[PDB]
Design a protein around this ligand. Structure first.
Ligand SMILES: [Mg+2]
Lengths: 134, 83, 4, 184, 219, 51, 127, 82, 43, 376
């Protein structure tokens, strides 16, 4: 809801519009162009930014999720979740890897299960789990 | 319907060209009428008003004011009987 | 030859 | 970097022809008739935010002059533009309609987006619990406010003329308004 | 330094004679190697003398569409006073280009405006209908002159009404009528012209044009 | 742009254009005879012209 | 290596004949009409029906051995209209697209030095 | 003017190629591996049915091709076309 | 005090050339392609 | 080769290789390494089933590494160069080096360097193209100039002749498998003969060699571990360390290092060598240091395009930041910038991988995995 509000020389015209009613009586009778254009705008978007700065492979959040599972202490991961902006929280939850063996999703559930035990930040942990199912 | 009896400025290709690609002029006057009515209402309002009356006032556009909360969805605005 |  | 009202950005460098300031590069905003009304710059991220008299603003990267984004707030001039310390939030304000907009250009999200009443508020009404207050103006639009935050949740523009009174029911979910246009 | 001072390349390229012998396979079949891996045309359209001056004044706008879009090779022959078109086999691609170009030149010869003639190149279903006033009714002297003025109308109003109503163009060259448009359209234009020749007053004809013109928009 | 243009009401373009400064021209003075012209730009420059 | 026929096109108000023969004209190779190619009488003179007839004729020409044709287009002539109509123009375009060389195009309408009376009467015809 | 090869076992059109002129003469050799196409332009194309490519393109005849005949034996180098 | 600005002499010289070209005599080529000789893609 | 054994069985739909009852079984370690190699070569998928590229490789009678090169080499008319390179590597090195000549007389040393320089013009950083120079130059030496050519340039005559014969046999195998006229193809000497490669062709060839030898790529030790091994401009090229892609990380990283050979074209270069190097094999003979038999240098994005087909390259989650919006078309299609990781995963701290430059990429979700389709 917050998104802002938005010929050929040889014209291939035929049928009744050009006075050929005989063809119609005898039974002879562009979205794919738009999607193809929608692709071009997709690549045109990628070429517009060519940022080459050296970034790390793993994000700050996913590293702690991996570390939390190893040490079985998601307190660091839980803390950064509480600090993340609502946009940041949603992006991370969507980006959790969904391929078998589903390690990250299981790790997130273990992280959220620890949070409920603390009886602190109860409304956010419940909300995080709601976003997980969504 | 009114039939033009003057030579068409558009060539026979153009009359077919535009066919390849309720009325803007009708809506153009509508904007003009609203402008004239708004201006006239302001001028009469100032004369018969006890208090001060302020004077009334491509690229994608932002809507500053919205009829419903942003978190609210259009689907949630419909009753079961409507659905 | 070209390669030489 | 110097910016002019006509819509030109000059890049000045100290260089030899013995050494002096010289315009090494010149950029132009090719707005059809809009004039530059406010400009701000963030040196750390090299962000240039320009608000035009037509009501639209552009975000640019310097010195490459890459147009990050272009949006319109309306038909009134953009009077003031400000940048956050981190450079991630842009605040714009239009004086004519009293609009205020905080824009997160990193995510293209809106931190704050508010427009006040154009006319004087004629009437007010608290929600029965006091959580919300409804206001009406001589313009003819009703705005719903949240007390805790102080921001307008919705604006209603059904009434043609000045809204004279607003009142809630004891239940509180329903609100009524009366207007000089001849409707309740 | 300014007086106000403080105090690898990654490559962009990314990996994405017939022989005189036979080979026999295990089945005894023969296996051979592969083999080594628009026609010239002409048309002539003669230009009548009264169309020579319009042709020269419109020549700058006539040869471009024939050369660029139709990929034909154009020439006007001063000695024979004719326009010559040729299909160039190395460049021309559309087998219908030449006959299309010949029709476009013919329409100009008949008196049609250049911009109306281009529709013959642009579209594919435009034709020219031609007939004489004597084919409808034997009119002579003043009776023939009055019939021509009845088709044209005052200031050409009756002709433009037919052209606008039927989506056609009409050339009234003395007693010779040429109508340019689509097949169903030029038959609509012909009935109105024939009614005028037979003597129906222009006002009554203009009324019928409105009825058909309304239908044309509906469909 | 450091230029001085000459104008008449009946002509749509300047009669003459004179480059008399490396920056904006702040002031122009013309004598009674209309023979000389003095200008001063915003570059510490003063120039006397035979117009 | 270029064998020529004669494509004789007769464009009437109510039909179109596409008729290919040898150079003499005594020998017919393929005659197709627009009325053989449509389901309604009203469409026999259409440019659509003349295009189907010409393509039908052009295929038969290529089989027999004809690779080029001269064109002799005509209208009804006599006491009636002298210019071949849209149906005849449609056939000529269809032959050109067909791939046959077009040799020479002539209008051979029967034009009277003098005529008998036309069928209309004194008040005219073709309402 | 499209030569089409149809595989009876698979029930599918396996190959489709464009020929120069209309063709009314076809000949298949006894070994069931070659096809000759004789056009009205006097040109001859020999095709490999199984692999679907043109092997020979003879253009020597003046008139339309009226008859084609393959000669050859299994395990031989004496393949001829008349 | 120091002054830095745009190149007004270079801008002025461009205008003087532009005025000279506009008011000078002009030679217009009036040849009609294809009028008496073959014209098109081939030659 | 043990990978020829594994590849053949997989084309037979024999899934259990490690436990297969051979009359004479190979080592399980060898079989396991063979399966991983065929996964890096794109012959086997992540579940160890043969792919379309694998089915083609099984038809070839060569080693799978060279079978992979010849398959991806039929682009931009680069195949004749690859056949010459593969034939030269198959037969051996025809270059007699200064150490063998015992000249490491001064005038002869000069001619040796001139003789090497004329063959080095193709590329400064690549030794494999120096093999391509002599093999292709040899086609332009007439019969009476052979021996003079050999003595003048200090080459081995008999080894060069065998290379030329192998080119004709090798080209037949490639054409017969790839060409639609599989059996009918006949090779001609003019096919083998070809002109100098263009710079675009040179860059493509480096990718084609990488296709076969992707697992044999090392990174300069400075890039991965700055300051663990001292580096400065005065240091000679033969002393610059390199780390193979899958080397097991020792407590002292110095052991993992491999070094450039003195005979390589890199030794005389002077400026700093490439960060990524593709090597044919490692040789511990010679006690100074472990030495690489280098082929060429591969850049970052070209390398990722090759390892893309195997399992040696992994992709991060979409990058977000200034001007890094993740365009998304469908729930199973998206375009985004991703930083690829080549070699060992970050969670794996035994083998030594590294991160390549970020690149825009078109990804399509398959089985819940965002597999890459192509680079933008
Ligand atoms: Mg009739």
């Amino acid at each position: 809801r917050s998104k802002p509000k938005e010929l050929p020389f040889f014209l291939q015209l035929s049928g009744e519009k050009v006075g050929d009613e005989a063809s119609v009586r005898e039974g002879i009778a562009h979205r794919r162009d738009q999607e193809a254009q929608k692709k071009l705008d997709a690549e045109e978007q990628m070429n517009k930014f060519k940022v080459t700065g050296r970034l790390g492979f793993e994000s700050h959040f996913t590293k702690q999720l991996r570390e939390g599972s190893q040490s079985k202490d998601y307190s660091s991961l839980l803390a950064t979740l509480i600090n993340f902006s609502p946009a940041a929280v949603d992006l991370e939850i969507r980006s959790l890897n969904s391929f078998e063996p589903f390690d990250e999703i299981v790790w997130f559930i273990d992280a959220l299960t620890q949070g409920l035990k603390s009886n602190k930040n109860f409304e956010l942990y419940e909300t995080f789990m709601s976003l997980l199912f969504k | 319907f009114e039939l033009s009896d003057v030579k068409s400025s558009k060539s026979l290709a153009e009359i077919y060209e535009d066919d390849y690609t309720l009325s803007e002029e009708l809506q153009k006057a509508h904007s003009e009428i609203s402008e004239l009515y708004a201006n006239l209402v302001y001028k009469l309002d100032v004369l018969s008003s006890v208090h001060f009356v302020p004077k009334p006032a491509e690229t994608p556009t932002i809507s500053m004011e919205d009829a419903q909360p942003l978190y609210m969805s259009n689907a949630s605005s419909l009753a079961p009987q409507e659905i | 030859n070209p390669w030489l | 970097y110097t910016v002019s009202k006509d819509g030109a950005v000059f890049v000045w460098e100290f260089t030899k022809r013995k050494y002096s300031w010289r315009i090494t590069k010149k950029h132009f905003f090719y707005a059809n008739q809009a004039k530059v009304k406010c400009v701000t710059f963030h040196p750390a991220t090299r962000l240039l935010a320009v608000g035009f008299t037509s009501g639209e603003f552009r975000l640019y990267d310097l010195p490459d002059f890459t147009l990050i984004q272009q949006l319109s707030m309306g038909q009134n001039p953009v009077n003031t533009v400000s940048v956050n310390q981190t450079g991630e939030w842009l605040a714009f304000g239009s004086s004519k309609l009293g609009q205020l907009l905080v824009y997160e250009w990193q995510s293209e999200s809106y931190i704050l987006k508010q427009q006040g009443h154009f006319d004087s508020t004629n009437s007010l009404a608290y929600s029965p619990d006091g959580s919300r207050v409804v206001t009406a103006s001589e313009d003819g639009k009703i705005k719903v406010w949240d007390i805790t935050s102080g921001f307008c949740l919705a604006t209603f523009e059904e009434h043609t003329s000045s809204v004279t009174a607003v009142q809630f029911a004891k239940r509180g979910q329903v609100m009524f308004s009366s207007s000089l246009d001849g409707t309740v | 330094v300014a007086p106000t001072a403080l105090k690898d390349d990654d490559d962009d390229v990314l990996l994405d004679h017939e022989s005189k012998t036979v080979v026999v396979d295990d089945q005894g079949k023969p296996r051979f190697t592969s083999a080594s891996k628009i026609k010239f045309e002409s048309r002539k359209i003669m230009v009548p003398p009264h169309r020579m001056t319009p042709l020269r004044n419109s020549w700058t706008k006539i040869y471009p569409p024939l050369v660029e879009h139709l990929k034909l090779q154009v020439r006007m022959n001063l000695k024979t006073k004719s326009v010559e078109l040729r299909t160039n086999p190395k460049f021309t691609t559309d087998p219908g280009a030449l006959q299309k170009g010949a029709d476009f030149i013919k329409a100009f010869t008949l008196g049609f405006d250049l911009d109306d003639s281009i529709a013959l190149l642009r579209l594919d279903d435009l034709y020219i209908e031609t007939f004489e006033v004597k084919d409808v009714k034997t009119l002579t002297g003043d009776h023939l002159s009055r019939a021509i003025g009845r088709i044209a109308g005052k200031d050409g109003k009756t002709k433009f009404a037919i052209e606008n109503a039927t989506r056609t163009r009409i050339v009234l060259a003395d007693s010779k009528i040429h109508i340019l448009g689509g097949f169903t359209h030029i038959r609509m234009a012909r009935e109105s012209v024939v009614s005028l020749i037979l003597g129906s007053p222009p006002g009554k004809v203009y009324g019928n044009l409105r009825t058909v013109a309304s239908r044309l928009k509906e469909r | 742009n450091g230029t001085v243009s000459l104008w008449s009401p009946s002509m749509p373009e300047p009669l003459v254009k004179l480059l008399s400064a490396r920056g904006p021209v702040n002031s122009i003075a013309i004598d009674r005879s209309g023979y000389y012209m003095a200008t001063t730009g915003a570059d510490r420059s003063m120039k006397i012209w035979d117009i | 290596s270029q064998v020529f026929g004669v494509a004789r096109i007769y464009a009437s108000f109510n039909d179109t004949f596409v008729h290919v023969t040898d150079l003499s004209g005594k020998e017919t190779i393929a005659r197709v009409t627009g009325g053989m190619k449509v389901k309604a009488d009203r469409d026999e003179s259409s440019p659509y029906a003349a295009m189907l007839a010409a393509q039908d004729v052009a295929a038969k020409c290529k089989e027999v051995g004809i690779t080029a044709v001269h064109v002799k287009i005509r209208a009804t002539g006599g006491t009636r209209t002298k210019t071949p109509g849209p149906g005849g123009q449609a056939a000529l375009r269809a032959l050109a697209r067909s791939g046959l060389r077009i040799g020479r195009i002539e209008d051979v309408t029967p034009v009277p030095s003098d005529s008998t009376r036309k069928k209309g009467g004194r008040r005219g015809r073709r309402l | 003017q499209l030569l089409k090869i149809f595989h009876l076992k698979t029930g599918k059109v396996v190959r489709s190629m464009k020929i120069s002129s209309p063709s009314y003469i076809l000949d298949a050799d006894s070994t069931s591996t070659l096809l000759a196409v004789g056009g009205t332009d006097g040109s001859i194309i020999v095709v490999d049915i199984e692999n679907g490519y043109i092997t020979h393109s003879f253009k020597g005849h003046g008139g339309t091709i009226s008859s084609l005949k393959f000669y050859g034996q299994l395990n031989s180098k004496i393949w001829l076309l008349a | 005090e120091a002054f830095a600005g745009d190149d007004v002499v270079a801008e002025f010289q461009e205008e003087k050339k532009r005025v000279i070209d506009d008011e000078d005599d002009k030679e217009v080529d009036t040849t009609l392609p294809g009028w008496g000789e073959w014209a098109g893609a081939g030659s | 080769p043990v990978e020829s054994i594994v590849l053949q069985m997989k084309s037979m739909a024999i899934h259990n290789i490690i436990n297969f009852p051979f009359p004479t079984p190979p080592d399980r370690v060898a079989l396991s390494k063979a399966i991983q190699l065929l996964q890096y070569l794109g012959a086997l998928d992540n579940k160890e089933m043969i792919t379309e590229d694998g089915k083609k490789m099984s038809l070839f009678p060569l080693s799978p590494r060279f079978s992979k090169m010849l398959l991806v080499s039929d682009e931009k008319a680069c195949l004749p160069y690859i056949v010459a390179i593969v034939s030269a590597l198959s037969v051996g090195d025809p270059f007699i080096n200064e150490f063998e000549l015992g000249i490491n007389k001064k005038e002869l040393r000069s001619k040796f360097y001139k003789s090497r320089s004329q063959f080095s013009k193709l590329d400064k950083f690549s030794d494999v193209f120096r093999l391509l120079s002599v093999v292709s130059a040899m086609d332009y030496v007439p019969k009476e100039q052979k021996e003079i050519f050999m003595k003048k340039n200090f080459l081995r005559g008999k080894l060069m002749e065998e290379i030329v014969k192998l080119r004709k046999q090798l080209m037949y195998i490639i054409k017969s498998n790839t060409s639609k006229e599989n059996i009918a193809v006949v090779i001609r000497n003019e096919d083998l003969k070809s002109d100098i490669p263009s710079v675009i062709q040179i860059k493509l060839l480096k990718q084609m060699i990488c296709a076969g030898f992707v697992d044999h790529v090392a990174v300069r030790a400075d890039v991965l571990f700055p300051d663990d091994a001292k580096i400065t401009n005065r240091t000679s090229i033969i002393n610059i360390p390199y780390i193979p892609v899958l080397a097991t990380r020792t407590p002292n990283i110095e052991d993992c290092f491999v070094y450039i050979h003195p005979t390589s074209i890199l030794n005389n270069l002077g400026e700093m060598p490439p960060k990524y190097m593709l090597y044919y094999s490692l040789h511990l003979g010679g006690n100074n240091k472990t030495r690489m038999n280098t082929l060429c240098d591969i850049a970052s994005t070209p390398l990722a395009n090759i390892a893309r087909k195997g399992l040696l390259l992994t992709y991060s989650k979409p990058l977000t930041g200034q001007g890094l919006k993740t365009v998304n078309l469908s729930p199973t299609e998206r375009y985004c910038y991703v930083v690829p990781r080549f070699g060992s995963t970050v969670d794996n701290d035994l083998k030594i991988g590294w991160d390549l430059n970020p690149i825009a990429v078109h990804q399509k979700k398959q089985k819940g995995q965002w597999t890459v389709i192509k680079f933008i």
